[PDB]
A paper describes a structure:
The human PRS family, which has 3 isoforms (hPRS1, hPRS2 and hPRS3), belongs to the class I PRSs that requires divalent metal ions such as Mg2+ as the activator, inorganic phosphate ion for activity, and ATP or dATP as the diphosphoryl donor. Due to the important role of PRPP in the nucleotide metabolic process, the stability of PRPP content is essential for cell physiology and is predominantly controlled by hPRS1, the ubiquitously expressed human PRPP synthetase. Mutations in hPRS1 affect vital cell functions and are related to many diseases and disorders.
We determined the crystal structures of the [name], D65N, A87T, M115T and Q133P mutations at a resolution of 3.0 Å, 2.14 Å, 3.3 Å, 2.11 Å and 2.74 Å, respectively, with 2 molecules in each asymmetric unit. In the low resolution [name] structure, the Glu43 replaced by Thr43 might destroy the hydrogen bond interaction between Glu43 and Ser103, which might reduce the restraint of both the ATP binding motif β2–3 and the catalytic flexible loop. It is confirmed by the MD simulation. The [name] mutant affects both the ATP binding motif and the catalytic flexible loop and therefore displays as low activity.
Numbering used by the authors:
A (entry chain A), C (entry chain A), E (entry chain A): 3 to 195, 203 to 313
B (entry chain B), D (entry chain B), F (entry chain B): 3 to 197, 203 to 317
The structure:
């Protein structure tokens, strides 16, 4: 009944999921033509099957998005009973408002695209905005790394009981204040005027920077600077989604980060070799369980 | 080509918007039936016209919403060329997300109902979350009162060069900072750690502190923020809200609270609330709205109003 | 699998339904904020469940309609298998045509609204117009009170065998002539020119006024007048939907109605205390059975 | 900007409507293939034009319907600015409800097919049920022949001040009463209690009786109503129908029936049926239709025609 | 669970299907009113049933199309679980492109119509164009007569091993070259300049004309001429869909066709009496099996 | 009213189309983020304008597609009166059918994505299958390079009166014949019977042979067709393609192949490929595209361009 398919060569996360469910990933022929067009074809009958497509990681987002849409379609016109897009890291999630410009609302495009391509359900993790669930008309199950982060903090930061959870920017206030609350410790916040202002006490205490995403690590590196200048004992950076493109990896080592935690919503094995302070939290049991429960009609809200 | 209609009988804002465009409100026979059903009937041809329906400030939100939808539907099947909803205060806006709960995204529902009833355009003001623009597939012009607020501050708060722009919650951070940076002043941020206390970040000592939020309902939060701000060395406290809801004990909570003044736009009618509250000052947003309609209809840039008070 | 939720505090009808099916109504937190906004949240997992929301009665129709739409939505994005709106009394059912004006077709609005909010199916009773079923694209099961009315007439009106079933207005012709037929007795009809014209024989015989709805009872009171003037022995008024707002209750006692039957599609317990000629027909076994059969794939057309 | 096209070759009404607007029918190459498939091909640019397709009275309803849809689809993908269907007689209208049965709502289906094929507007006449306007989400201008009927009565029936306007069924009650009240005359109502008799309510004694229905198909009902009316003391009987279908034995049933006259609009072509039937008189509804198109295109009030024969 | 309904009186094909599945065709009342309107009503409860409507054959295509749409609708608002339109011969399939004119794309109209009327799935045979599957958003299972044709050719044409599969027009190139390939024999092609040009060798060998459709048989008759002129030993004509309207039947006998094969996607029993060279291939086991497999969640792609 | 925007920075075709209409390309801030996400931001009001977005020839199809969609979406919510996609070469066109496989109809998907992102019109050139026009419900103007190709042949191939127009595959038959008939010359057709040989039908002996296909990607097919054609007595071989893709070893395969010349339109930028390939000649299709936009906007017949090179 249930059938798990993967996206790009990124096959690690989808393989870890298929394991926890006692399945083999479905057979698919997936490639690019010489002239850049994505070519996919399902290697088995999916008729009347509850079908999961776990988004791929070969960096190239437009390539990954299209191959996702093509698989979702492939499956829909081949009479799969239901198709869930499993997108730990929601593409274009940061382009969710105009922001006073004549810019597009790209997350609403992507959302539309996933739906018209035929997705019946979405399973994602830590949406850059909670209102992105409102971009769809189909059910979205938005998972949190929150508990997996807390566990780690407690289990890895000796002084956590008197640490400060700091946000990279002004928009992150809500996310850090919740983590500050569950732990019962101080929060603070940074804001690029440039010059970086910090509000809240971080003197003589551990300072964990929490952000949902890192991309160039420009803001997150600087943030760590400023946190030293304001006399934080040590500075950690916890990012649910670790994208680390461009100069990121070298900017990280170069910074004072005691460590930089990520989830494996994005493949990290390559960047680890080039960065020793990186550590991963496995999110495959969280996605596997959300798949098993989405299938069975059992609750998912627990995992939250 | 242009035609403006009001909802209900809270017609002040409607009529001011119409005055400023040189127009009379369109004729509407609108009443509530014995069983609470709303009735509407366009007292005039709207065939091939560019129609605007302005959302009423009566108070009863579900009544008010049904009426808006009904007039939209009324005009569409009457062959209006285009129907715009002018909803200065967006209903169910504070309901834009699931919040770890098994709860509706009421705003996306309302978004949806506005769409199917036949709206082509929306013109709203200071959406509780910008992301609500993504709840539609039609265009949305989301206006800001920021410019007006800045103008109000500059011209009424002597110390505005040395003040502190404050968020009464964690969600409102970008909004304050954005004003802070423009006036080239400091910002502070109040977080409440529920049961049942509030924590302040950012220096407010010996400064004037201005509470800025997008909307104030019962005013339980802001009153407690006026106290915490004073406790932390604030010379005095201002509260500026774009949407003046002031339901339940709000008016009481305000007359008691240590606010120097509470300012609100007229996105929701205040005239009555003022009579019981001498702290309340009112920014007139009909010049913003009218101009937005005027531009919408002509094909002129509305973006001009995002930073520049007409 | 099946789950019944209620609307407003009106909890009597939905409780009667849940009983006949051997269920407890689902847990929900339903209220109004100080500033009039409806706030609902489902108190249990509805994932993969056939979900019934029985419309509420706290008079205020826009309040009741919205809380209905919000529950239908709540349920849809929480991955309920199917959501049926159970609306004995269809809101705005009288606003189903323009009627030569620039008026809205409100029943088509509401219909659209129920569908976009996510209803998969509608179970209703005595639609003010049969063509309101054509306002949807989803299945509608429209139930009749017809048989429950006939039974009552026969069982309560000694002279029924030679009575006359009269209509309040010209539009009711079809509904009364069917009831006149099943019983094999005379029909007649009234029409406000005002002055009220009556066509058809009512001299020396019982005269039962049948209408689908009563609101102020202005037309129905007058109708009874005229029926006396034309020498009806006694005058009954049978209304499937008893709304009785405004002066209705006092207009009723004040009138010669031997009695005024209603169904309990609307709560009547409060108006009964203020009106002794009122009697109710319980429609909960009809709605309960339509729910059980809609669930099971068994026929509903019988109940008709 | 305006362009009018006809369906099939029943082009009288089409051509009269075009004459009255000062236009020639657009060029259409329309034929039926060997296997019964319909072909259409717009013999001219319609790019950015305000197109009207008038529904043909050929007779074969499914043929006729497909053709209408095809021309609509043909014009839409050809970038017509707007496509209006002018369907004087709405197909499958008598199929607007389920009627306690497991039957289709064919009218809502047709409604749906008209929509997806790309119609933006409908202009129809005397919908069997007004509620069919709720089968669309696009605008519908539903025209009445009432005004014309009133005008026909006044000027041809000497006793119209003392007559009785009759419904041949229970469904047609509002329609008669509405005419009754306007002419300030009495109304009667015939109900048939199937097997197999008819029952009359309302005095018709020593009065002229006018049967008014929206459409007459085989005329089995109306003929039996002419007899029952005469039986109940009617001086004489008129039958007025907005849609003259007259299929099967209708023409026979009519020449035999005790009608003084049978009147019908030309919403469906009668010229041929007339030759075999000298009782048939024909109200010309092309001035109504043309005016409705003319207003539609200009942005003028169509409602003017609901009570006032142009 | 499964329920098969038929279209017009054409009841042979649908009866053959219902047999192979061990079912009786569903009860339906289907007629035309005196004024040409199609009147249908389902004679049984279809609630929660997987419903198949096998398109009818009473020649009149607009009549057949509408009665199809009406049945699909009837079923949808009566709460059938799923409705599959079974359309061996897709109506208006030749009107699938503009072709440089301001002509409609009728196959896209019909496709839209089937979908809005409520079809969830389509089972068809030899679509005039494969891209007609792209006219829908619902699954389409397009079956081939290809294998049934090959079998017949091999089993009926002694010299087939050295025969030539010829196409009537230039557009048929793809269809004939595939049949030429599976058999490993020559193909050729004809094209009306009129004067008919033939490309490819047909001298001294059997020449089978393959087309998806025949209508007047004007092109197919002429084609056979030309094939004689170019010295084909014998000429067969294989048409998946045999419509044969107008002068066709007389044009066929009058031509040199050794024989003219068809499928029974259209009723042929009447034209056989008037044409002895006609032979039919039964496609009912192919449609019956596609129905049984579409129901069961078992593969259909095999049949291909 | 009219406004033209380019995608990416492959702005030659865009700029030529704009030059020919007397317009400057609209202002666009378009860049790729660090994580490969595309950004777009319309540097100017498009409110109530008739906008055209021209598809870029960068190369990376999924990048290019996302960008197009994004600009479409960007303009729609910015209240553009109408948004047209001008996609000289339609992405995923060769993916229009299932081909007996469990494969996507990528073209119908792309069709769908173009629709939901908010396109009102498409203007494309030589769709791989005409049937792709049926993947939309909006209008599509599908242009032909046939006229230009005919004009190129007539004026560069001396023997064009005696030549043979060839299809490199079975699918391309109608396309060649259509050119064959117009020039009143013969046609031939190459079929490949995969593993691994090609079979020719139609006399090419002692004639000039012109390979005509709609697109050429790696050129593996056409090179092998140049050889087979020469083998079968062709004086010499021309290859004409409307869409010059030339990826992978194409440029190599071409310099080696016995083509007298390879011709392509500039639907995809060739300037760079030319420098490495002296066989490549380039038909300029911006006069066709501009004219198509010019007509689209005015309401003039585009069909004029289907047979007549402006």
């Amino acid at each position: 009944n249930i059938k798990i398919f993967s996206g790009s060569s990124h096959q690690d996360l989808s393989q870890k999921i298929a394991d926890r469910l006692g399945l083999e990933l479905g057979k698919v022929v997936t490639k690019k033509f010489s002239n850049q067009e994505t070519c996919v074809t399902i290697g088995e009958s999916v008729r009347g099957e509850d079908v999961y497509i776990v988004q791929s990681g070969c960096g190239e987002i437009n390539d990954n998005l299209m191959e996702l849409l093509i698989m979702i379609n492939a499956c829909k016109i081949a009479s799969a009973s239901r198709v869930t897009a499993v997108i730990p890291c929601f593409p274009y999630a940061r382009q969710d408002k105009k922001d006073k410009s004549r810019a597009p609302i790209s997350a609403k495009l992507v959302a539309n695209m996933l739906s018209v391509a035929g997705a019946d359900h979405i399973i994602t993790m830590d949406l850059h905005a909670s209102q992105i669930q409102g971009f769809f008309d189909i059910p979205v199950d938005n998972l949190y790394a929150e508990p997996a982060v807390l566990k780690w903090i407690r289990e890895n930061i000796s002084e956590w009981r008197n640490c400060t959870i700091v946000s990279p920017d002004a928009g992150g206030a809500k996310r850090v204040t919740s983590i500050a609350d569950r732990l019962n410790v101080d929060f603070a916040l940074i804001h690029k005027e440039d010059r970086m202002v910090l509000v809240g006490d971080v003197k003589d205490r551990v300072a964990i920077l929490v952000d949902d995403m890192a991309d160039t690590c420009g803001t997150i590196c600087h943030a760590a600077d400023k946190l030293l200048s304001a006399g934080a004992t040590r500075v950690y950076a916890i990012l649910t989604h670790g994208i680390f493109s461009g100069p990121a990896i070298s900017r990280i080592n170069n910074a004072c980060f005691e460590a930089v935690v990520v989830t494996n919503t994005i493949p990290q094995e390559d960047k680890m070799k080039h960065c020793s302070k990186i550590q991963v939290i496995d999110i495959s049991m969280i996605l596997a369980e959300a798949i098993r429960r989405t299938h069975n009609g059992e609750s998912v809200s627990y995992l939250f």
